């Protein structure tokens, strides 16, 4: 008899639409400690992990752990039917047969509820290890989306190089060559626009820009995005949710010639 | 790690290509003179078309090869829009080259693009020919449209003779100091079927699997209906000894070979089997009809038995 009441329901819609383009279906590792999602890319190149801590909900009542798996596209589609200021509460039975989505208007009697058909998926825990990264970049989400979408016209691949002074985004393609140099923010009062770069040794990796365009869909979730990267380890893109959790992304670097 | 022998010993200059000598010399002449026209390469796979085109482009453009050469393969998208957008814009792209040099567009597996793509490629080939040249490559020349061949110098390639295969293989052996025997060389040549790539790959796989190269190991790794047994098959068919031919066929079938493999190897043996020319043509026609029946679904052992019977009755 799962029950989870969320006051700020608009977050869930942004969570789903950030995944529907990359992942079609996923298993929600629902536990009394919170909601967790970890699904891997269809082409097996990338990977996404999601964590929703139980303390962030208005009321969390996961009496027993669930391994619920839904369709991300279908779940997102219903979520557009929910207003940006409507209270959203998820509910599951004593057994995970159907998903009860409850949309409650903040100040009027209009109440909407939906039920979702479920899915059976054979998934396994994937060994995401915690390591220190030789390069950590903390830059505005909008700026990262701008850079990713700009170089997408240049070419399908982007070369990311970092130094102590700043980070350089380089690309090359059929219409020409271009590179964006972003120096570390010398002095800005708030990080929301500051570009914070922490690095140990110089790094240089190439990534497909199609996925990076997919990755940028989570920009509305948080004003700032953190990029973690090191030599011979996949790029790590994490969006810090407000007192709720994080949406961490993982993408293997492309092959150098 | 080490590179595959098909790449570790890929020729890097036109001087070390053992293919059709006249065409290789013509390519060298084109490289020297510079102003090469649009060229189309067709022939059996793995005879060196891609290697020849790459070596020609490297010789012509030299250091400018990085940005003066555009290469598309079946692995890339060669659609109707790509030839309209990538090829056209690359042709319009400004590159400064010496007087005898031109921008080279290489389309390997040229037979793979559709009719519309080649029709669009026609004009782009025609317009920018003053500064852009095309180097097409394909296995079947009929697949590329007639106007394209008309406005190109079609260069035929052929299956390499066993002498050229033997020379290249012996060179590789000297490079690798691989032990060998004449029977192993004959077997690797037979498995090659005039294909340098196939020969090198089979030789490397055989050496990896067993080291010393002999017919036994070669046929172990390159498992196939053994050519000798097929030779007694056809010999028995000539002598009208249907029972012995069936015995060999049943042994092969119990070994588990698919009928397609058996019939293909039978025909291949019928290539070089020493036997009357008219009777050989009769056998070839009958094997062709049986291969029709096999390829269209009827692949039972009974079909191969009927083949043996009809071959026996051809000699009466």
């Amino acid at each position: 008899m799962f029950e989870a009441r969320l006051v700020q329901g608009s977050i869930l819609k942004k969570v789903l639409e950030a995944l529907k383009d990359l992942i079609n279906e996923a298993c929600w590792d629902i536990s009394s400690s919170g909601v967790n999602l970890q699904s891997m890319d269809s082409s097996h190149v990338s990977l996404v992990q999601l964590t929703l801590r139980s303390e962030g909900f208005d009321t969390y009542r996961c009496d027993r752990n669930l391994a619920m798996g839904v369709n991300l596209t279908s779940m997102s589609k219903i979520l557009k039917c929910a207003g940006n200021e409507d209270i959203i509460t998820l509910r599951a039975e004593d057994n995970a047969d159907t998903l009860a989505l409850v949309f409650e208007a903040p100040n009027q009697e209009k109440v909407s509820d939906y039920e979702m058909k479920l899915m059976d998926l054979d998934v396994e825990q994937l060994g995401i290890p915690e390591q220190e990264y030789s390069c950590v970049v903390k830059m505005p989400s909008g700026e990262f989306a701008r850079i990713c979408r700009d170089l997408s016209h240049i070419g399908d691949a982007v070369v990311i190089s970092c130094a102590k002074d700043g980070v350089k985004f380089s690309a090359s393609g059929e219409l020409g060559n271009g590179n964006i140099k972003l120096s570390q923010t010398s002095n800005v009062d708030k990080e929301e626009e500051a570009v914070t770069i922490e690095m140990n040794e110089p790094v240089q990796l190439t990534f497909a820009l199609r996925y990076l365009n997919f990755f940028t869909k989570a920009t509305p979730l948080s004003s700032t995005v953190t990029l973690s990267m090191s030599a011979d380890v996949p790029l790590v893109v994490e969006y810090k949710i407000a007192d709720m959790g994080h949406l961490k992304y993982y993408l293997a670097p492309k092959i150098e010639d | 790690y080490e590179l595959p022998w098909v790449e570790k010993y890929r020729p890097v200059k036109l001087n070390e290509i053992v293919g059709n000598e006249d065409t290789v010399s013509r390519l060298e002449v084109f490289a020297r003179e510079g102003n090469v026209p649009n060229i189309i390469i067709a022939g059996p796979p793995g005879t060196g078309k891609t290697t020849s085109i790459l070596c020609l482009a490297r010789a012509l453009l030299g250091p400018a090869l990085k940005d003066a050469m555009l290469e598309l393969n079946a692995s890339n998208d060669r659609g109707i829009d790509v030839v309209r957008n990538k090829i056209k814009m690359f042709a319009q792209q400004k590159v400064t080259l010496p007087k005898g040099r031109h921008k080279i567009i290489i389309l390997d597996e040229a037979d793979s693009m559709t009719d519309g793509a080649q029709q669009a490629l026609r004009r782009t080939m025609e317009i920018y020919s003053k500064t852009t040249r095309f180097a097409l490559a394909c296995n079947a020349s009929d697949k590329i449209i007639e106007p394209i061949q008309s406005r190109c110098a079609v260069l035929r390639y052929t299956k390499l003779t066993d002498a050229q295969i033997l020379t290249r293989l012996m060179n590789v052996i000297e490079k690798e100091r691989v032990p060998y025997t004449d029977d192993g060389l004959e077997a690797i040549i037979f498995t090659a079927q005039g294909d340098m790539r196939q020969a090198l790959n089979n030789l490397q796989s055989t050496f990896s699997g067993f080291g010393f190269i002999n017919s036994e190991n070669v046929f172990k790794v390159c498992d196939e209906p053994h050519p000798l047994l097929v030779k007694e098959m056809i010999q028995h068919c000539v002598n009208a000894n249907i029972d012995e031919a069936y015995k060999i066929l049943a042994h092969l079938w119990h070994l588990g070979y698919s009928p397609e493999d058996i019939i293909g190897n039978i025909f291949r043996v019928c290539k070089t089997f020493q036997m009357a020319e008219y009777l050989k043509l009769e056998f070839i026609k009958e094997i062709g009809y049986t291969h029709m029946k096999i390829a269209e679904g009827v692949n039972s052992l009974l079909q191969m038995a009927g083949l043996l019977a009809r071959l026996c009755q051809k000699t009466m």
Binding site: - | E7, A74, L302
Partner: protein, 318 residues
């Protein structure tokens, strides 16, 4: 319950049978890191896919197995080559190091242009990606494509090396099986383990007992006694009564002219005919079997088979 074909699918290298040399060679390649691209071909249901899955699971743990092995099937389709396959092969690993792996089930279904695209992709990233191509017919593979990989032929399972595997299933799934029932189960399987398991399960479901007559009825395959009777009728009885007997038997037991014709083919080569008579019979039976494929009237073809045999009687007696 769960069908026994996957309920007892091999899970480790030891579960596989009759391919110990191939398994040893692939194990040696894995241990020495020289693993090349693999081309596995043979009759259906001989364990090629299970073999490669066992090797991969040996090399890769399940935690990283999903993120480092891209299993795909060709019949699910050129966009596959340029899409997921290219994307997977164009990047290195996520967590572990070393070469990735792509398994392409039913590789023979791809078109020639798709095979050329796959060949180009394979040659481009041969250093860090290995391809396992699984197909039934080697001849369906482009000669250029098969010149990049080592070819392994998985032959049909010989009985005595596949009988013990069935015995384990019988001990597990409690079904009484006779000696002749086991022999017929082997014979109809014809080296196909999946066929053997499916026939065993269907026979157990149909009657709960496995015996030669039971399995032959369940699969509809003609019995050896029936084939001997048909051959005797054609060789001895006159045309009208032979036709009546054969038609009656066929309609009674629901026999198919293809299986009938194959079995008389085997008997013809088994019996001692004169050489010319055998040649004539083989030519005829081949012609009839060709005629069945296009979809002709079965009665006329059966009578034609009888005709092919009935002619020889005077020839054989003399």
């Amino acid at each position: 319950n769960l069908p026994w074909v996957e309920k007892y699918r091999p899970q480790t290298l030891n579960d596989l049978i009759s391919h110990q040399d191939i398994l040893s060679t692939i194990q040696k390649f894995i241990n020495e890191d020289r693993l090349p691209h693999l081309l596995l071909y043979g009759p259906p249901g001989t364990g090629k896919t299970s073999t490669i899955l066992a090797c991969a699971k040996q090399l890769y743990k399940d935690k990283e197995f999903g993120s480092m092995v891209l299993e795909l099937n060709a019949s699910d389709d050129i966009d596959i080559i340029r899409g997921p396959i290219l994307s997977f092969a164009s990047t290195r690993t996520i967590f572990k190091k070393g070469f990735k792996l792509v398994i392409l089930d039913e590789a023979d279904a791809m078109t020639q242009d798709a095979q050329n695209a796959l060949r180009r992709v394979i040659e481009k990233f041969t250093e860090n990606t290995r391809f396992c191509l699984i197909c039934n017919y080697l001849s369906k593979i482009i000669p250029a494509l098969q010149s990049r990989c080592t070819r392994f032929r998985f032959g049909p399972l010989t009985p005595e090396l596949m009988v013990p595997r069935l015995e384990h299933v019988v001990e597990e799934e409690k079904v009484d099986i006779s000696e002749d029932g086991m022999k017929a189960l082997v014979t109809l399987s014809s080296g196909d383990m999946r066929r053997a398991l499916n026939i065993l399960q269907s026979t157990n479901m149909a009657f709960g007992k496995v015996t030669e007559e039971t399995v032959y009825t369940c699969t509809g395959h003609p019995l050896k006694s029936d084939i001997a009777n048909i051959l005797d009728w054609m060789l001895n009885q006159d045309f009208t009564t032979a036709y009546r007997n054969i038609t009656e038997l066929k309609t009674l037991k629901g026999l198919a002219l293809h299986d009938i014709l194959t079995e008389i083919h085997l008997f013809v080569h088994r019996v001692d005919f004169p050489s010319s008579v055998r040649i004539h019979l083989l030519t005829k039976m081949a012609d009839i079997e060709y005629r069945l494929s296009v979809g002709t009237n079965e009665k006329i073809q059966l009578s034609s088979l009888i005709a092919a045999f009935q002619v020889t009687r005077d020839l054989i007696v003399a």
